[PDB]
């Protein structure tokens, strides 16, 4: 019927004075734009069809053509920034917002989706969608006693669109928009659908990716316990954003970090630091590095949960980027830790794998390790065991590596290595 029309036939039908011919041509356009292989987005734009689709969004007495044009425009807006911009430039944003209140759920859903693609283009279009007033009607769609009475796909699209209104930086979303969205977002974060949970966690991760004031906005809503629960989920698409959110939160103040610890997060890190997905291990070790950059009582809670052996393990064997995060976690630990915590770190076996990482061709990790080693030596000086440490570093071949660092192509590396071999191995 409407399968595989040419752009020319679509144009002919949409330019007729016949609402039904326009409906069939718009459906044919929708089908072209929904084909799996390279939809003719640019051809549809160059035909000048976006304005007509936008006008069709307003034809209340023909809900089928509203739906079909909403879908066509959704898929145009799914493309490049230029194609989304073509949709916006046609006046689509206000028409979709007006469709959010459509009594036909499939049409409102299509408007939600379209607005999500527009907002997903980036910060400018996100904020323009917000200025046109999309948040009120979007959240009104979710103002029900129990989210379970909404259709799974409807709810998933609403959540994904909201996540895009929370996404992107430079600039971040308007503070008032975030505050308006958060109560609904937290309600979705407690819903039982894995895709709703994943996109809610992503939204929260976006909101916590920034200065401490944004973190505080989120933490004040009490979502941290729920984030830790999701951190222990089986579905990787949930763990990943939950871990990202937790990592963001612990980049904030020590109080925010403590909220994460008190929620029980550290108990999940035995699994996360041994998680077979490289990205989980990396992000978990990054989160650990930011926790070991906290207070001494927080380092102490890292110790109490038994995570130092897991950092020793990561340092001993993991993808290099994870090992770099583990090196950072060790340097932070040794910069902020007590002498007893630093010796405990050594008794867990940190020295050998740290020295083994000194044979890397990356200069940052080298400097990080030398700083950690120096901090450990300073601890030994406070204990008088500097010589025992020097010996330990020598047995595992570390002295050779430091001597080689003397002839390194970096100045700070040279100064650190020379300083170590002069203050200790002399």
């Amino acid at each position: 019927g409407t399968v595989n029309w040419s752009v020319e036939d679509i144009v002919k039908g949409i330019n007729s004075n016949n609402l039904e011919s326009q409906l069939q041509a718009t459906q044919a356009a929708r089908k072209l734009l929904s084909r799996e292989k390279q939809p003719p987005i640019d051809n549809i734009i160059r035909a000048g069809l976006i304005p007509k689709f936008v006008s069709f969004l307003g034809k209340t007495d023909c809900s089928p053509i509203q739906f079909e044009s909403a879908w066509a425009l959704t898929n145009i807006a799914s493309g490049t920034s230029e194609q989304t911009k073509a949709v916006v430039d046609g006046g689509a944003i206000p028409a979709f917002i007006s469709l959010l209140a459509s009594p036909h759920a499939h049409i409102s859903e299509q408007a939600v989706w379209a607005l999500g693609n527009i907002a997903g283009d980036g910060s400018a279009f996100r904020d323009l969608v917000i200025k046109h007033g999309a948040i009120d009607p979007l959240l009104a769609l979710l103002a029900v006693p129990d989210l379970s009475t909404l259709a799974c796909g409807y709810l998933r699209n609403l959540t994904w669109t909201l996540s895009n209104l929370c996404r992107n930086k430079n600039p971040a979303p308007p503070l008032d928009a975030v505050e308006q969205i958060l109560p609904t977002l937290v309600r979705l974060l407690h819903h039982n659908d894995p895709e709703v949970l994943a996109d809610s966690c992503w939204a929260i991760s976006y909101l916590t990716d920034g200065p401490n004031e944004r973190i505080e906005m989120v933490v004040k809503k009490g979502v941290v316990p729920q984030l830790v629960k999701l951190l222990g989920a089986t579905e990787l698409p949930i763990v990943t954003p939950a871990l990202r959110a937790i990592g963001n939160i612990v980049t904030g103040t020590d109080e925010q970090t403590q909220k994460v610890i008190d929620a029980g997060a550290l108990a999940v890190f035995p699994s996360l630091l041994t998680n077979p997905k490289t990205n989980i291990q990396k992000e978990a070790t990054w989160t650990m590095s930011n926790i070991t950059a906290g207070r001494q009582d927080q380092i102490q809670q890292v110790v109490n949960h038994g995570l130092v052996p897991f950092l020793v393990g990561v340092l001993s064997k993991a993808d290099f980027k994870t090992q770099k995060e583990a090196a950072w976690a060790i340097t932070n630990y040794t910069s902020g830790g007590t002498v007893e915590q630093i010796v405990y770190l050594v008794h867990c076996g940190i020295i050998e794998p740290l020295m083994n990482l000194l044979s890397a061709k990356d200069t940052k990790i080298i400097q990080v390790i030398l700083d950690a080693i120096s901090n450990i030596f300073q601890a030994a000086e406070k204990l008088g065991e500097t010589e025992k440490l020097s010996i330990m570093i020598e047995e595992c071949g570390g002295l050779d590596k430091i001597e080689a660092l003397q002839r390194h192509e970096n100045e700070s590396v040279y100064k650190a290595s020379l300083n170590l071999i002069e203050k200790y191995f002399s």
């Binding site: 980049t251 904030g252 990054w286 590095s289 930011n290 950059a293 950072w328 932070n332 902020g336």
Partner: peptide
């Protein structure tokens, strides 16, 4: 300390 990616 507070690496923030």
């Amino acid at each position: 300390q507070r690496k923030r990616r």
